[PDB]
Fold this protein.
Amino acid sequence: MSNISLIVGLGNPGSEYAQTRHNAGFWFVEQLADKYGITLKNDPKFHGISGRGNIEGHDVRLLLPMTYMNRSGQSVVPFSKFYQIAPEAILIAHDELDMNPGVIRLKTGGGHGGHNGLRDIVPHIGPNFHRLRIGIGHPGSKERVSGHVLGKAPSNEQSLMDGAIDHALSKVKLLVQGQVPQAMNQINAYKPA
Ligand code: NA
Ligand code: NA
């Protein structure tokens, strides 16, 4: 029922990380920001890059922590405390190992699912924020997980992921308008065209 007023993209800073699957949440938020002409500027007070503007009739903040993934909470937590944004108004976009490329899900609540960014966030604001789980695949062995999240995907997997992200961006109107059950049905029904 509450409007989404803060959208957070999780990822690592620097050009060596920018195309890595771990930066799926940066992809989503950076595309969104540019779709609506919202400028992401350096915001060192909150250890991130941040912005604010109109999306489909609503005042929305955007945040990319520049803390490195595992310390994402050092940006998100004080940012959302300072602007007094309840967790229920936060959507956090992140890579999801447990879903394949081309799969994308909106989830409300729950835990971190082993994701090391969310792991740094859930303890401080609690679990009740919305999550855009952008599927990146699982390599297979738990050995190869680090090299997979920190690697660039091949073009085919990338096109599926980018398709998923395009679809979720088309649904942000619902989310910022408070229409979370509808956004969720519609996001979660996505399948590659
Ligand atoms: Na822009
Ligand atoms: Na920008």
